[PDB]
Amino acid sequence: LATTSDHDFSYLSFAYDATDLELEGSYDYVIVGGGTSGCPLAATLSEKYKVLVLERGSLPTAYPNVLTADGFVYNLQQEDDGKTPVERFVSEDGIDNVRGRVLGGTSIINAGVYARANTSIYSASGVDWDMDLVNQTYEWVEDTIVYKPNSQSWQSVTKTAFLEAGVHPNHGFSLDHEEGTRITGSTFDNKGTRHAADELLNKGNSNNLRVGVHASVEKIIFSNAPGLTATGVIYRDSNGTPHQAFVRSKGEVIVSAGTIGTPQLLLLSGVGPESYLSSLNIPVVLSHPYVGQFLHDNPRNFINILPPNPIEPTIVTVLGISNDFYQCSFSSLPFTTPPFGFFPSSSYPLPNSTFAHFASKVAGPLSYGSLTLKSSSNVRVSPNVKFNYYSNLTDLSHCVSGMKKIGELLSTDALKPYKVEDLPGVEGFNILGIPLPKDQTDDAAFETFCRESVASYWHYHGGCLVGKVLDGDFRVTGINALRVVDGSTFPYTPASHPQGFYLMLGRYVGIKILQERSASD
Numbered sequence: 134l135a136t137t138s139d140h141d142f143s144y145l146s147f148a149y150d151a152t153d154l155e156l157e158g159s160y161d162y163v164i165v166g167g168g169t170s171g172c173p174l175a176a177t178l179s180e181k182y183k184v185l186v187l188e189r190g191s192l193p194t195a196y197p198n199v200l201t202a203d204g205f206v207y208n209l210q211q212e213d214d215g216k217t218p219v220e221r222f223v224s225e226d227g228i229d230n231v232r233g234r235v236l237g238g239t240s241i242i243n244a245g246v247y248a249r250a251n252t253s254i255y256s257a258s259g260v261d262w263d264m265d266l267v268n269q270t271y272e273w274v275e276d277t278i279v280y281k282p283n284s285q286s287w288q289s290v291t292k293t294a295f296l297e298a299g300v301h302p303n304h305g306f307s308l309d310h311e312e313g314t315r316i317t318g319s320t321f322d323n324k325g326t327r328h329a330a331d332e333l334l335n336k337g338n339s340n341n342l343r344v345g346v347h348a349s350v351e352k353i354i355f356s357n358a359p360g361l362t363a364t365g366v367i368y369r370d371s372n373g374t375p376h377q378a379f380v381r382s383k384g385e386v387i388v389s390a391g392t393i394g395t396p397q398l399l400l401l402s403g404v405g406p407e408s409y410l411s412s413l414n415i416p417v418v419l420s421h422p423y424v425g426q427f428l429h430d431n432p433r434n435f436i437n438i439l440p441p442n443p444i445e446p447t448i449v450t451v452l453g454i455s456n457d458f459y460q461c462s463f464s465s466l467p468f469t470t471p472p473f474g475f476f477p478s479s480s481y482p483l484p485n486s487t488f489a490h491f492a493s494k495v496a497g498p499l500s501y502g503s504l505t506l507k508s509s510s511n512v513r514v515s516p517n518v519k520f521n522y523y524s525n526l527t528d529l530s531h532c533v534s535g536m537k538k539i540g541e542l543l544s545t546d547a548l549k550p551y552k553v554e555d556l557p558g559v560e561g562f563n564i565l566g567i568p569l570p571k572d573q574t575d576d577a578a579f580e581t582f583c584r585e586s587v588a589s590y591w592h593y594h595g596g597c598l599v600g601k602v603l604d605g606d607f608r609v610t611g612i613n614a615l616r617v618v619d620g621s622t623f624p625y626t627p628a629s630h631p632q633g634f635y636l637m638l639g640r641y642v643g644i645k646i647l648q649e650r651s652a653s654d
């Protein structure tokens with residue numbers, strides 16, 4: 134774990150605006166997307182080789198509010214002008230959502246919750262994991278940007294509610310995703326300063342690592358040397374001037390553009406379903422049927438209570454983990470400008486007093502959809518995405534169980550002081566939005582509640598799966614010198630909160646690449 138300190142911007146010494154980067158560069162590795170996985174991957178590779186990271190967004194310094202916990206809601210409330218760190222989008226399902234667009238990626242705009250992946254998911258992932266390396270990597274990340282949180286009144290109230298409601302056992306303070314209640318780590322330090330993936334760039338070699346911001350990567354370049362191989366990428370700067378960055382012998386292009394950005398770039402580059410690409414007149418580099426397929430978004434269902442007595446805003450630290458659903462509570466200040474993506478749509482009531490958001494995330498999820506291009510040529514145009522929430526009934530059964538558990542929390546002695554009226558069961562609270570069915574045994578009513586009140590937990594993943602598009606070493610099958618490392622590689626979520634796993638993944642693969650280069654020297 135790390136110790137509270139200012140956000141470390143030492144890496145600015147090797148950060149450049151794309152307009153300032155050479156028109157044609159040569160490196161050992163080119164990383165597309167300076168995000169959650171991309172940054173630690175880049176830093177790791179730079180320990181020995183020349184690396185260039187290309188990020189479409191700005192430096193975190195351009196948007197000060199992404200640097201503090203009290204800025205979380207603010208970023209979501211800001212209008213999307215195409216340059217802001219929070220990019221808005223709506224799934225085909227009709228659910229509002231957001232993704233990061235800034236150096237550090239989505240780890241720069243998230244809720245800060247940090248957890249290590251469920252230790253039981255590595256065996257069936259399709260990857261032969263080196264567990265000693267996995268833990269060493271978690272430690273590497275944690276010693277730089279993860280903190281043991283301060284005690285917080287509302288989080289403590291939530292902890293008492295979970296324990297009263299049977300979410301056992303109690304793990305005390307622990308980073309591990311395990312059934313029961315615990316206080317986990319956070320990327321926000323004890324002074325409220327946000328730490329993120331960008332700071333992991335400081336772990337790289339300042340003479341080998343170069344970062345380009347405001348760099349929109351539009352296409353991967355290929356050649357037969359002799360076999361199909363990725364040779365570089367084309368990116369554009371704010372002046373509209375296109376640049377090219379190539380990789381040298383044994384080097385590689387690694388796409389870490391995220392669940393949404395990676396499949397989009399692959400499709401735009403001619404790697405995807407042959408009939409789909411041809412229909413849009415995109416030359417086919419390699420037929421890859423699963424690019425953009427298997428897009429998963431864990432559903433979030435919730436209850437907002439408006440206490441008669443004000444509660445203080447807090448950062449999420451207490452987690453109530455069940456096998457089929459994960460829960461927590463967030464307390465915040467009132468507002469008249471809605472944080473996009475918080476509620477599923479714009480027509481939702483606004484809180485004029487402090488409130489508590491009890492959220493429930495369904496495990497998996499088993500349901501999935503796909504990603505398709507909205508523009509066949511412009512990478513700045515958001516792709517179309519559909520998640521098909523609750524299309525798999527097992528997800529729905531888990532939502533029902535999850536919301537019943539929330540009902541239990543609402544019926545605890547712990548939450549009584551927050552009701553406006555002392556009514557039986559879950560009744561008596563001042564609710565903002567859709568309330569739970571009164572009858573806690575009415576399954577059909579809970580299914581309707583789950584379907585009509587659903588929102589995104591913002592932990593979408595998939596779209597470029599290991600075993601479908603990638604192999605066990607994260608290489609895009611059939612293409613040399615090309616890998617994918619980010620949240621797009623697996624169908625199920627690694628824990629209640631995935632950033633820890635994706636941060637680890639970046640360096641993990643980086644180390645695997647270095648070990649591979651060592652053997653071939």
Ligand SMILES: *[C@@H]1O[C@H](CO)[C@@H](O[C@@H]2O[C@H](CO)[C@@H](O[C@H]3O[C@H](CO[C@H]4O[C@H](CO)[C@@H](O)[C@H](O)[C@@H]4O)[C@@H](O)[C@H](O)[C@@H]3O)[C@H](O)[C@H]2NC(C)=O)[C@H](O[C@H]2O[C@@H](C)[C@@H](O)[C@@H](O)[C@@H]2O)[C@H]1NC(C)=O
Nearest residue numbers: 249251252264265267268302303304305307308309310311
């Ligand atoms: C990689 O890192 C993992 C954690 O992220 C390791 O794991 C943890 O390893 C701990 C031993 O080093 C193991 O023991 C600890 O917990 C014991 C019981 O914990 C549970 O029950 C307690 C009360 O019943 C409760 O308070 C607690 O919150 C837990 O619910 C305790 O008896 C021990 O004194 C010790 O404190 C952890 O349980 C374990 N946690 C997880 C998430 O699995 C992992 O190491 C483990 O790998 C296994 C494959 C196995 O070999 C096991 O023996 C080993 O400890 C690390 N792996 C590597 C390769 O280093």
Ligand SMILES: Cc1cc2nc3c(=O)[nH]c(=O)nc-3n(C[C@H](O)[C@H](O)[C@H](O)COP(=O)(O)OP(=O)(O)OC[C@H]3O[C@@H](n4cnc5c(N)ncnc54)[C@H](O)[C@@H]3O)c2cc1C
Nearest residue numbers: 166168169170189238239244245246350394620630631632
């Ligand atoms: C509002 C919100 C709250 C969340 N809360 C939490 C939490 O508390 N804890 C947790 O564990 N997880 C949380 N998550 C989820 C977690 O943050 C994400 O799953 C994780 O950051 C995704 O990592 P990634 O590397 O795949 O993608 P990203 O970090 O998004 O990185 C991809 C990067 O690629 C860039 N990019 C995309 N396309 C291009 C292109 N063509 N050219 C150049 N650059 C490009 C993007 O701008 C971005 O910086 C939250 C997510 C959101 C949106």
Ligand SMILES: *[C@@H]1O[C@H](CO)[C@@H](O[C@@H]2O[C@H](CO)[C@@H](O)[C@H](O)[C@H]2NC(C)=O)[C@H](O[C@@H]2O[C@@H](C)[C@@H](O)[C@@H](O)[C@@H]2O)[C@H]1NC(C)=O
Nearest residue numbers: 497498499500501521522523524525526527528529624625
């Ligand atoms: C919802 O998710 C389930 C778990 O992934 C699906 O069932 C699983 O389907 C696998 C191949 O389709 C099969 O190997 C697994 O054994 C099976 N697991 C279970 C718990 O049965 C389920 O798929 C449907 O139901 C199963 C039983 C089969 O009849 C499939 O043909 C069905 O498609 C998923 N349901 C949906 C709506 O996709």
Ligand SMILES: *[C@@H]1O[C@H](CO)[C@@H](O)[C@H](O)[C@H]1NC(C)=O
Nearest residue numbers: 251253254311312454455456
């Ligand atoms: C951890 O993962 C295993 C294997 O996928 C699963 O059986 C178990 O339910 C998970 N535990 C939790 C608490 O999510």
Ligand SMILES: *[C@@H]1O[C@H](CO)[C@@H](O)[C@H](O)[C@H]1NC(C)=O
Nearest residue numbers: 439482483484485486563564
């Ligand atoms: C303020 O919140 C209360 C619930 O506490 C609600 O009844 C009222 O309508 C809200 N005021 C406005 C004008 O939205």
